[PDB]
Amino acid sequence: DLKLPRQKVELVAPPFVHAHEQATKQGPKIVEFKLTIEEKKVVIDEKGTTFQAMTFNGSMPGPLMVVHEGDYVETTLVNPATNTMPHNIDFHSATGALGGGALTLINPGEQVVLRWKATKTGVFVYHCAPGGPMIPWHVVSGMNGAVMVLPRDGLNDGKGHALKYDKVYYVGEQDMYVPRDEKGNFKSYDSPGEAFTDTEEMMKKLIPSHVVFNGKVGALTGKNALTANVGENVLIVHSQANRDSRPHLIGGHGDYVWETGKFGNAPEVGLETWFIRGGSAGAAMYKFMQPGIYAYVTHNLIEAADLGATAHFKVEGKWNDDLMTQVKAPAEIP
Amino acid sequence: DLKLPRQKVELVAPPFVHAHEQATKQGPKIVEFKLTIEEKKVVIDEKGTTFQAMTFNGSMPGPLMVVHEGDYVETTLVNPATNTMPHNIDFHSATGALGGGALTLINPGEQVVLRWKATKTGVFVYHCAPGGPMIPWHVVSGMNGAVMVLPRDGLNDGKGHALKYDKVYYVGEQDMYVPRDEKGNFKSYDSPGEAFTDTEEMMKKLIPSHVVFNGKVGALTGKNALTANVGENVLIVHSQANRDSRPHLIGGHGDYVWETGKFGNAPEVGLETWFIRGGSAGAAMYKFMQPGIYAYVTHNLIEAADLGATAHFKVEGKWNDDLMTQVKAPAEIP
Amino acid sequence: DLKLPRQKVELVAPPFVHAHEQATKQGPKIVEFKLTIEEKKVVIDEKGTTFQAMTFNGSMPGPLMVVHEGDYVETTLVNPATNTMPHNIDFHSATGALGGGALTLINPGEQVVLRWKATKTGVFVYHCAPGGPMIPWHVVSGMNGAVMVLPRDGLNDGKGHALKYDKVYYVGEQDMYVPRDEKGNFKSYDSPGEAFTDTEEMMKKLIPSHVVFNGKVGALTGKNALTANVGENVLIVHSQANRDSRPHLIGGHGDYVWETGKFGNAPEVGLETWFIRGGSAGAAMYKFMQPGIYAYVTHNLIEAADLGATAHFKVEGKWNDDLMTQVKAPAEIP
Ligand SMILES: OC[C@H]1O[C@@](CO)(O[C@H]2O[C@H](CO)[C@@H](O)[C@H](O)[C@H]2O)[C@@H](O)[C@@H]1O
Ligand SMILES: OC[C@H]1O[C@@](CO)(O[C@H]2O[C@H](CO)[C@@H](O)[C@H](O)[C@H]2O)[C@@H](O)[C@@H]1O
Ligand SMILES: OC[C@H]1O[C@@](CO)(O[C@H]2O[C@H](CO)[C@@H](O)[C@H](O)[C@H]2O)[C@@H](O)[C@@H]1O
Ligand SMILES: [Cu+2]
Ligand SMILES: [Cu+2]
Numbered sequence A, B, C: 001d002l003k004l005p006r007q008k009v010e011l012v013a014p015p016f017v018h019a020h021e022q023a024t025k026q027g028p029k030i031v032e033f034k035l036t037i038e039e040k041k042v043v044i045d046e047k048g049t050t051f052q053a054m055t056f057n058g059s060m061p062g063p064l065m066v067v068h069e070g071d072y073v074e075t076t077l078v079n080p081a082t083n084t085m086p087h088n089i090d091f092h093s094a095t096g097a098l099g100g101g102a103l104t105l106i107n108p109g110e111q112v113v114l115r116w117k118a119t120k121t122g123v124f125v126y127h128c129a130p131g132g133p134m135i136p137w138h139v140v141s142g143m144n145g146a147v148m149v150l151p152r153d154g155l156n157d158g159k160g161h162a163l164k165y166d167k168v169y170y171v172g173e174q175d176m177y178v179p180r181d182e183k184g185n186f187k188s189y190d191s192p193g194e195a196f197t198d199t200e201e202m203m204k205k206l207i208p209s210h211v212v213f214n215g216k217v218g219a220l221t222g223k224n225a226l227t228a229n230v231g232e233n234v235l236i237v238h239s240q241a242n243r244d245s246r247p248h249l250i251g252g253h254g255d256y257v258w259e260t261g262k263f264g265n266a267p268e269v270g271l272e273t274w275f276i277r278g279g280s281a282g283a284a285m286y287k288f289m290q291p292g293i294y295a296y297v298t299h300n301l302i303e304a305a306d307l308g309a310t311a312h313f314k315v316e317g318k319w320n321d322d323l324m325t326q327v328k329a330p331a332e333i334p
């Protein structure tokens, strides 16, 4: 008989995050979320390569869910009849029943409601896990996201000082396994089912064909570049449900980084590159000091430049010549 | 002329650990251990794939040895005449002579006795290292284990509070390289010697055919599942002598984790997934809050589900509906 | 109008480091460095395999640059007309313009001068990054190095105690991708340009053919072994610009380790193996307790023993039988 107040959240597509408070005077609530599974063929690169995706809420990654320590998270998972497979959800933030997996298995046409208490602070992966060989396949097909469980007093630096972010972005990195035909071209399939045999043979060799942020090569570039201004403190949440990543902000730093992603631990300071362990999420905060283009990459540069894993930030403001200056422009050698 | 008291230890096969004290009032002793090398053909999967294993004491991993800071560890290594190759032992816990390697090289028919002082606390890898290209081959053939060097006052949380475990398990993860024939089937060999050429070609490509806990697919499942009860604090020691692993307790957490495995460092708290660097051991403690099945995996899920790297825990006790509850069971979508 | 004193540094080839102070009473200066790009065909292994290298100052890695927090680093980058490609430089230690990349693009025949303020302490990677698919190619061709930014008061253990090193070595690890012909032999090329197509196809498969310290198999062995004496505190700086490494000193430990490489964070103590994230540098200090040969390796032992990634230390001094002793030499089993 759990009679706490209820609060609905309207989830938003990554890399944006639904509005939330950092430090709050609210007590525990039941926070209500809904996720609807969609299986769909998507284009993942600039050459028109297709991929049989399975998603929460139609996006890779799934949306970031934000709650505070001690809240109860009540999720409605819906598997519409237009899908062909059973699905479930496992929250790394939750305790028991394989993270909820064992309580949320639903066939097409069904829905389920799980509630779990947010007893551990940090950013955590959630993903589908419908048993056996299906677990890796569903996850690398795009069925993963993250949840952020904040302390009620907001983030701190471990030395008693508040760390308040002006905005948060969620970057979900996805390793994809697209088989090639004899010619050397990527193959296309009519269904996830048909993709399965060839996709599993490739997965077991452990080398992805693509590594992408937000579902596609170039997803967070151009018009969809991340943005900030000089003086803004930005939190970047990064998740990888299956394989390690090494985030790096080219031209910046991680001023405060929780590489294991758990706010019970003090953050590390002044990082160049941090490490997100496969099956986890981490978070890094940086205060922009300079305008211009930044690239956020995994610093396996082959993955970043050749397999898809580069985002951009466009930052506005005034150039600081004390920090960096071109003393002499390119000129002929004397 | 080292005249301290002597204590013999009867080693036990993993994942169990020989009886020991955590905090102790004993002073330094000479703790005596014996390891006998066995080369043997073993079955590593459910389809009957065979593998030319080389082991300490007949198991993969080798047994966990437990001592306290300041003890002297005296190991008798025996290489019976039934073996075909020279072997040795290197302890990452020890100082000098390539970890003992340079002092323990023995041909079939010989034995040696090494003593080293346990000056550094934590869990450490030990492995065979008989020079040059043989070093990786012997290690990935199964010749590795771990030693745990406890503080005399037991483990602590870094904030002055004792951390006492009710039981400890040792999970050794092994990357195996089994070549395939033209047909696509795994190959079998009559000797380790004969396996060598094909095995080395495959090793150099860096992708394992199998990744297993305790020597075999499914070794820690079914009747040999790990066990606990709600309320029990369990320490899991995890080693990987050659390749990175990312342990994850599905349905739980790492309440206290030493991912680099060294007790001179405070543990991290509240992890979802931790990282064991190739050539190291780590340790994670969790107090079970819920009954039921848990899976302990490396959270490269392809490795976990498809290459062999999943263990189970069966936990007894009372379900806690506050922590997690199925609010509404699978029903048709309204 | 920046009128601070100027200091020139004569860079030295790795693994040596140019003379510097640890703790200093100097205030901020403009420290002046010059790097000259050389493209050249080099031999990378004992069987005579060749490789189209691109380097800073003719070495892989590029030289270590050492400054103190608050200094201004003024680098002249020179791209002589004997080179065939444009190049630039990105410092992970610097803030803005893609680490300087966006301000330092130079064609053969040109030079440029960049100045940046060293606001963050630690060891940082620098590398070429001339846009798009060229970025990984230039980096894995050898164009990377590191810079060390010291606190003005020198290193500390995080508990108020100074950590002073008696010598420092810089070990740069390079992943190389050398394609093979139909026969199975490594291919040779007349130019970097010609190597590009085949090299890029191989890079995208993510498995190196060689992994080497200081540019070549066996570079830091034999006459070029690293050296120390019992009682000496040695700092080893390790960088990897593209791919993870797991350094291990066989026979020793990391007494104090900054695995993420940033001196704003206290070091970890008593490590067996540490982890250098791709796109970063780390640093580990050890006081030698025993004489003899040590091997410093990445503890993927296949990489260490078979792909090139092993260095040696030769240490002089007196054997300590308390720490380790052969109690009984190899003898026949009774
Ligand atoms: O041209 C036939 C010849 O090509 C191979 C591939 O080398 O197979 C191709 O043709 C087969 C018959 O048309 C197809 O079944 C197959 O998918 C395709 O690779 C050989 O196996 C065959 O002898
Ligand atoms: O059928 C002969 C033909 O098959 C190949 C493989 O395509 O080799 C097979 O047969 C050889 C001769 O019997 C064996 O030595 C070899 O091990 C096996 O692969 C071809 O090389 C050969 O022309
Ligand atoms: O002997 C010709 C036969 O060999 C193949 C490889 O199996 O190609 C080799 O010879 C070609 C023609 O000389 C070369 O172009 C090629 O580089 C080499 O591999 C077959 O393709 C060909 O039928
Ligand atoms: Cu699913
Ligand atoms: Cu998971």
Ligand SMILES: [Cu+2]
Residues within 6 Å of the ligand: B054, B086, B087, B088, B128, B129, B130, B138, B143
């Ligand atoms: Cu051996």
Ligand SMILES: [Cu+2]
Residues within 6 Å of the ligand: B090, B092, B125, B127, B279, C248, C299
């Ligand atoms: Cu080792």
Ligand SMILES: [Cu+2]
Residues within 6 Å of the ligand: C054, C086, C087, C088, C128, C129, C130, C138, C143
């Ligand atoms: Cu270049």
Ligand SMILES: [Cu+2]
Residues within 6 Å of the ligand: A248, A299, C090, C092, C125, C127, C279
């Ligand atoms: Cu970089």
